[PDB]
Amino acid sequence: QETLNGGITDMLTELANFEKNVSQAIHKYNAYRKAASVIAKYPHKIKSGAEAKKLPGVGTKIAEKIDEFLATGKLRKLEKIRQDDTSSSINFLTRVSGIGPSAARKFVDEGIKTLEDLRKNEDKLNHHQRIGLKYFGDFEKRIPREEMLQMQDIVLNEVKKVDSEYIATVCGSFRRGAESSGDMDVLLTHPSFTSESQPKLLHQVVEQLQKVHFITDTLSKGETKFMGVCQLPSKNDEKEYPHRRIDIRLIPKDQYYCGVLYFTGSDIFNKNMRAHALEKGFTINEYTIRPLGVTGVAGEPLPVDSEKDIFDYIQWKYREPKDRSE
DNA sequence: CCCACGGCCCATCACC
DNA sequence: GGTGATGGGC
DNA sequence: GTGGG
Numbered sequence: 001q002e003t004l005n006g007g008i009t010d011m012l013t014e015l016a017n018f019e020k021n022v023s024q025a026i027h028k029y030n031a032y033r034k035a036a037s038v039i040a041k042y043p044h045k046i047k048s049g050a051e052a053k054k055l056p057g058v059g060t061k062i063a064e065k066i067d068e069f070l071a072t073g074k075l076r077k078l079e080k081i082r083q084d085d086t087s088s089s090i091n092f093l094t095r096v097s098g099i100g101p102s103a104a105r106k107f108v109d110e111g112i113k114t115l116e117d118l119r120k121n122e123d124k125l126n127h128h129q130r131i132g133l134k135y136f137g138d139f140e141k142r143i144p145r146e147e148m149l150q151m152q153d154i155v156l157n158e159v160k161k162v163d164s165e166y167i168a169t170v171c172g173s174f175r176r177g178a179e180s181s182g183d184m185d186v187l188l189t190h191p192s193f194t195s196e197s198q199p200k201l202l203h204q205v206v207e208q209l210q211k212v213h214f215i216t217d218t219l220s221k222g223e224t225k226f227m228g229v230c231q232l233p234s235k236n237d238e239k240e241y242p243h244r245r246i247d248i249r250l251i252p253k254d255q256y257y258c259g260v261l262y263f264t265g266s267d268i269f270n271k272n273m274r275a276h277a278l279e280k281g282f283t284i285n286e287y288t289i290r291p292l293g294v295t296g297v298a299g300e301p302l303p304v305d306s307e308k309d310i311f312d313y314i315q316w317k318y319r320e321p322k323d324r325s326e
Numbered sequence: 327c328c329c330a331c332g333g334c335c336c337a338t339c340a341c342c
Numbered sequence: 343g344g345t346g347a348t349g350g351g352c
Numbered sequence: 353g354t355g356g357g
């Protein structure tokens with residue numbers, strides 16, 4: 001229930017963002033986010049810092065902040081950083097795709113604090129940053145599953161049309177049956193591309209998707225990883241659909257399913273499955289599953305033809321994508 | 327007291 | 343021109 | 353900031 005401890009998880013999430021974007025302290029960012037997660041999943045309305053401290057990832061200092069929040073309805077440090085022009089400006093600008101904590105600080109140092117200021121100083125943005133600025137509003141919109149369905153239809157049709165031997169899967173929140181998504185994650189393979197192996201295989205797919213005006217902009221494109229922008233087509237009368245983020249990854253056929261597993265199931269689910277695989281003497285990464293020897297020495301990758309094979313290896317009961325939140 | 331904390335591709339920067 | 347470091351994303 | 357060596 002959101003109404004349960006939302007004040008607290010809103011407080012921690014805001015603190016997480018200031019640590020990441022202003023303080024450049026990624027492990028404090030993660031610490032606040034962990035604390036917010038476990039608190040959000042906690043079945044009761046917290047009454048004290050001490051009650052919260054029992055939970056793993058809640059320490060003395062978050063416990064102290066919860067006491068102040070519950071006693072006053074506020075956190076002084078947060079009220080202050082909220083009113084601070086430089087800090088609130090830095091935090092805001094990192095919302096632009098391609099502006100991280102370092103670019104944000106440099107921009108605010110030379111008086112560039114707003115979107116308007118960025119529009120007026122485009123010569124000082126790289127390519128990625130210009131696209132992020134151009135689509136600022138569209139990038140913070142979520143993608144209803146209906147639209148994701150329409151998007152999958154276009155990606156699977158165009159892929160098959162370039163070469164019928166391509167395998168494409170839409171992974172991420174979408175493949176877990178989420179009713180909305182932040183972006184589209186596409187994994188691509190082809191029988192000609194294995195571990196013991198052309199860079200045109202990715203290029204060709206991106207090109208076809210640009211030819212039918214589904215992909216509108218490129219943030220980054222290599223031999224194996226594409227990041228860009230797409231848009232569903234509209235019906236003249238009907239209003240333009242928002243621009244959406246799409247990632248396409250080319251993966252060797254023999255690492256494909258390790259990829260599908262990784263880029264599909266929740267990060268939490270990936271961490272838990274990884275943790276359990278260690279218990280059973282296997283190291284799993286995004287690429288491969290390897291058996292650990294007696295001394296912890298990683299053996300050669302095991303053959304994987306399906307997701308289920310990975311589950312089998314670590315003697316786990318196969319979990320459909322929809323049941324991979326944790 | 328001290329260290330770890332998911333890790334890798336791609337763009338661009340610093341430097342040679 | 344090139345390599346390696348850094349920032350950024352996810 | 354939290355956990356744990």
Ligand SMILES: Nc1ncnc2c1ncn2[C@H]1C[C@H](O)[C@@H](COP(=O)(O)NP(=O)(O)OP(=O)(O)O)O1
Nearest residue numbers: 172173181182183262263264265266267270332352
């Ligand atoms: N450090 C990491 N970087 C990227 N992916 C990671 C990861 N750790 C775990 N993963 C896994 C878990 C992720 O599922 C997957 C990539 O998906 P996203 O697009 O990053 N997020 P999702 O699609 O779940 O949700 P939505 O976009 O709707 O917010 O990679």
Ligand SMILES: [Mg+2]
Nearest residue numbers: 172173183185
């Ligand atoms: Mg996603």
Ligand code: NA
Nearest residue numbers: 053055058059
């Ligand atoms: Na604790």
Ligand code: NA
Nearest residue numbers: 094096098099
């Ligand atoms: Na950003």
